[PDB]
Curated annotation (Swiss-Prot), chains A, B:
Its EC number is 1.2.7.4. One of its GO terms (molecular function) is anaerobic carbon-monoxide dehydrogenase activity. It catalyses: CO + 2 oxidized [2Fe-2S]-[ferredoxin] + H2O = 2 reduced [2Fe-2S]-[ferredoxin] + CO2 + 2 H(+). [Ni-4Fe-5S] cluster binds at H259, C293, C331, C444, C474, C524. This is Carbon monoxide dehydrogenase 2. GO terms for biological process: generation of precursor metabolites and energy; response to hydrogen peroxide. Keywords: 4Fe-4S, Cell membrane, Cytoplasm, Iron, Iron-sulfur, Membrane, Metal-binding, Nickel, Oxidoreductase. It comes from the Bacteria. Pfam families: Prismane.
Length: 634, 634
């Protein structure tokens, strides 16, 4: 019954192949884990010192308290805070990598990289207060890179990738509650300190710390998007395809997987240089395809087709046609290294801090990026030769995907309706009800949830109710693989008001047709683009973000990064749905803070709801409450 | 049977009182936790994403692997690395607090603080390369504080509080393995990143990262000692007392508990100013007593008597005579806040990131330290008045404690035997066998181990075999409470060779008697002082630390900080005993790295041994192996 595992037909087909070949998958490893520990599920477990492990029974008799005296409240809040810090750290590593790449590029130390988007460079400099008039671009960029690195530590200003990206009224609310981060890595360390044994032991205090660390995560996301746009170009609308059918038996199929475009962008360019070398090996060329966020990055900037996402990543290998999987860090199931020996795929790690036993490691240095890419791609070509004559099973399943909707691109599209007030047509249509509100789908797939089922079920209900839907990360991946990024599906999916707006925008952009049903805003760091759009709307309207009819949904969340993103969505003022249970239910006081009393602090709040049709109703209620608060019909 | 819980008679007496009063203790909460989870005990549990909790059976059938494919090796190494990062973070917060205090002091923003040890200031400046000739002390100190803060982040130098405190040959070995930290908070964040889902998944790679983060912990320890010595004075030999009998029914009894002398040092000075105000309230005065590291800090610098330590901290309250417990952060059982309502004690938190529900919070700002201290101490005086006429039960049990053996003080003591080559008399007596080697006892008490039993059992065996024993933290606390810091016990405890050396040193220092059986080197950050001594010996001999007959023992370890300290002891080259099981036994490959193959990387290694007489034999074998490698009899 493969539809219980994934709603993606291509994934189902590969699940059948894996089963008859005896190749264990993530779903099999989940089945082998059941029943999962109920202490961990509820958050009522602590291993923060060597007197543990400690646990607390959700109900009944002892144990009721940790050995040191830590209550359920404390234990739950500490575990949650550590997850937020871990998510922030992954974003810290990604953004910091980009900042070092930009610095090296403009210092002449990494000639494969350059300032591709000078307009974005200057507009970031202006946002930060860095002077541009009379300055060389390379010096402006050096100052931007230095400012990015400075936000990792304490200094005489707070984290500018928070305070310069949200409207002053939001910054004021956050400052009044002590929530503005002092430095990105500073906050990560402070979380790890305060949550260590015998430190912070007040749930509200712990959770305020977590909100602040989530803003350090936001800063890392925003910095990552900013720097990748400078280096690799700001996305604009592009047309491509998704799902396993984008693999080609007669090509060298190379997946880029992980997160940082410092790696994947060069793989894309260098692969085009090597087309004749691939052809000498009997291939048609090198077919680069994307998995997870780094796939999203190259999809957004270059139209590289997306192979698959998140929980189903192993299935690309099961086709037998995946010659190489080129990795950097984050969200890579380490099972890929063992599956590769069964499928023939060459799995290649590239980052010193992210190795997998059994995978080939090829260090990738920005200073030698082109040469390191050629070494990697020659391993892929060799692998293609080894499967000469071997049958492959690529499901002939793909969707059309229109993407590339950076905030700059959205504003440009709207400007065709109103050149000097581009946000006004969007606002006008919220007011007249053609657009009920906005929902951002974000985050991962999670083996506990049939793959994509929550994203598609919720998105369908919202689209029929005229909600403008935007998406990032593997939420965008779920939606694209089910046709939600194909404008041919607007009539089927969209309410009449939303269809009218998507059509009016599309026709004014010369498309002869509408924008797609869902706007793909990019990778998970590119949730920052949604922040830029929402902050721009708030500024245009003269209200704070917690008055806008905008919600978020991490409908199938998995990674610590998704916990961090959901927490900063709450902190900036949004009603934020999570469609899997975070480890909080073991403390009613913590649950009540996160789902209710945080409204009084930031105006946002979590909506924890595992049933997707119920979650859609709750999301619509949250949007409609925001509409009523603005005096609008709903 | 209270001797099964603690070997300290005073603690036993208070356990009996707590039992008849119905006051739950840490031992009761431990009993209620049994049997503890065997997945957590072995390290075979992961909660690093929302697909978890995952576990692996140590033996038998499925589950054998985490849902994402993470092996036992990976899961164990990731959990260990996060513990190291958490320990480093606690040390980051402590050192950073001191650096900000020093900066404020010399900028005129915190007049309660000053440069007390100008010699230490100048010798730190010289060690770091900061010019002193022709400079004002306040400017030198500003540069030292700036250098301390700079070591938290990446810059054009590595962490100087690693590279300037170990000999070049050690730094070279560590650099060859990529182990020198780039920045303290940078490494903490990198650990949290690499251990997040879908990142590093190679045990050896993960553990190398952990070794590097442990050096970030060492830098925080060393920075903490350096800055506290500048601000509050370098310790020199002092005589005081320990155990609950240091409480006085007729005084206002105030415990300082937690970690940072920025708080406790001012409590000590201000309490003396308030003696007439305490007397107006009917007390004899304010009797400041120490718990845990901040108690050690004021013991070492001012001879403030130590009340108790670590696992037995609640027992101070059970006397009924503890009027106030003044907290900052780390190692404070949060049970103290509920026990206070039973005992009448006023528990006061002071740090924004370390609150306890039910405790009174009085913010403590360096800028207002004296005034904030008076507010705190007036709460203590009010509490004393409330117990007028109430019987108290203070066990009449105390030991004499000689302490204050900073490395500077040890060198000075030795200089009375050899003025211009002070380390030579120590080396001479190692060579002639009067001193077999050196053992550092460090770390906590742990409820799993009858309190102090491992420290005292191991120390007795080593002292009889002529080992020079030094101690810090609650290891020093255990030893002092059992008489190991009283020179009157030298004849009973020490082998003839060690007694001869302690006597020769003591007589040359005018004592008419020996140094104490164990030298108290201070708080847990002051494990850095032992590093300074051992590095000085290595430099004097022209060999690396992994050739010296020096070992460490975290005999009853508890906190993540103790895991970090033990890991850096290994990383700098020492055989390092741990007397409780860290969560590693679920992976034989990880255990083998930590106990054996790390020898080939750093020359140090863990000795995991829960039986203390066996651990003593293993420690002596390690010392004697080092002696043999130097060509010495043993
Ligand atoms: S910190 Fe407290 S609750 Fe956590 S493992 Fe240690 S004793 Fe148990
Ligand atoms: S990171 Fe892997 S092993 Fe850990 S909880 Fe998630 S799926 Fe399980
Ligand atoms: S890249 Fe990773 S953070 Fe979630 S959105 Fe996709 S599994
Ligand atoms: S102060 Fe804490 S780190 Fe251990 S040595 Fe004492 S319980
Ligand atoms: S008792 Fe299962 S997660 Fe700890
Ligand atoms: S299963 Fe008990 S510590 Fe997780
Ligand atoms: Fe991602
Ligand atoms: Fe301590
Ligand atoms: Ni994501
Ligand atoms: Ni300690």
């Amino acid at each position: 019954r493969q539809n219980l595992k994934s709603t993606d037909r291509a994934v189902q087909q590969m699940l059948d192949k894996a089963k008859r070949e005896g190749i264990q998958t993530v779903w099999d490893r989940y089945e082998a884990m059941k029943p999962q520990c109920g202490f961990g599920e509820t958050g009522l477990c602590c291993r923060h010192c060597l007197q543990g492990p400690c646990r607390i029974n959700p109900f009944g008799d002892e144990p009721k308290v940790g050995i040191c005296g830590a209550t359920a409240e404390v234990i739950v809040a500490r575990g949650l805070d550590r997850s937020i810090a871990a998510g922030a750290a992954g974003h810290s590593g990604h953004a910091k990598h980009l900042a070092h790449t930009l610095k090296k590029a403009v210092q002449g130390k990494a000639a494969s990289y350059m300032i591709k988007d000078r307009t974005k460079l200057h507009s970031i400099a202006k946002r930060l207060g860095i002077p541009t008039e009379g300055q060389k671009d390379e010096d402006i960029a050096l100052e931007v890179a230095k400012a990015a690195l400075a936000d990792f530590h304490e200094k005489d200003t707070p984290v500018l990738w928070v305070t310069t990206v949200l409207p002053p009224s939001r910054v004021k609310v956050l400052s009044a509650h002590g929530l503005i981060p002092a430095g990105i890595d500073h906050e990560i360390a402070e979380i790890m300190h305060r949550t260590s044994m015998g430190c912070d032991a007040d749930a509200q205090n712990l959770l305020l710390g977590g909100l602040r660390c989530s803003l350090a995560d936001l800063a890392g996301c925003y910095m990552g998007t900013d720097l990748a746009d400078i280096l690799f170009g700001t996305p604009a609308p592009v047309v491509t395809e998704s799902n396993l059918g984008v693999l080609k038996a007669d090509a060298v199929n190379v997946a880029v997987h992980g997160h940082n475009p410092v790696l994947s962008d060069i793989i894309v360019s260098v692969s085009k240089e090597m087309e004749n070398e691939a052809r000498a090996a009997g291939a048609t060329g090198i077919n680069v395809v994307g998995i997870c966020c780094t796939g999203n990055e190259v999809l957004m900037r270059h139209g590289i087709p997306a192979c698959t996402h998140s929980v189903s990543q192993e299935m690309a290998m099961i086709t037998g046609a995946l010659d190489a999987m080129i990795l950097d860090y984050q969200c890579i199931q380490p099972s890929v290294a063992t599956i590769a020996e069964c499928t023939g795929t060459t799995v290649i790690t590239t980052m010193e801090m992210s190795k997998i036993t059994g995978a080939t490691h090829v260090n990738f240095a920005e200073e030698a990026a082109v040469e390191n890419a050629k070494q990697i791609l020659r391993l892929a070509i060799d692998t293609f030769k080894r499967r000469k004559g071997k049958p492959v099973e690529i499901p002939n399943i793909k969707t059309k995907v229109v993407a590339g909707f950076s905030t700059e691109a959205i504003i440009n599209a709207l400007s065709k309706l109103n050149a000097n007030d581009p946000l006004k047509p969007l606002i006008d249509n919220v007011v007249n009800g053609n657009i009920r509100g906005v929902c951002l789908f974000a985050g991962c797939n999670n083996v506990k949830v049939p793959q994509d089922q929550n994203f598609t079920t919720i998105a369908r209900k919202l689209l029929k109710q005229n909600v403008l839907v935007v998406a990032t990360g593997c939420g965008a991946g779920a939606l694209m693989r089910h046709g939600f990024m194909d404008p041919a599906n607007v009539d089927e999916l969209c309410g009449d008001g939303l269809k009218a707006v998507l059509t009016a925008i599309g026709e004014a952009n010369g498309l002869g047709g509408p924008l797609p049903p869902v706007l793909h805003m990019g990778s998970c760091v590119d949730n920052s683009r949604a922040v830029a759009l929402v902050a721009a709307l708030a500024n245009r309207l003269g209200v704070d973000l917690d008055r806008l009819p905008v919600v978020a949904s991490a409908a199938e969340a998995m990674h610590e990064k998704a916990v961090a993103i959901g927490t900063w969505a709450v902190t900036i003022g949004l009603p934020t749905h999570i469609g899997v249970l975070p480890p909080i239910t073991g403390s009613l006081p913590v649950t009540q803070i996160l789902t209710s009393s945080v409204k009084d602090i930031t105006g946002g709040y979590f909506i924890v709801e595992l049933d997707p049709e119920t979650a859609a109703d709750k999301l619509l209620a949250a949007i409609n409450e925001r509409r009523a608060g603005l005096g609008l019909p709903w």
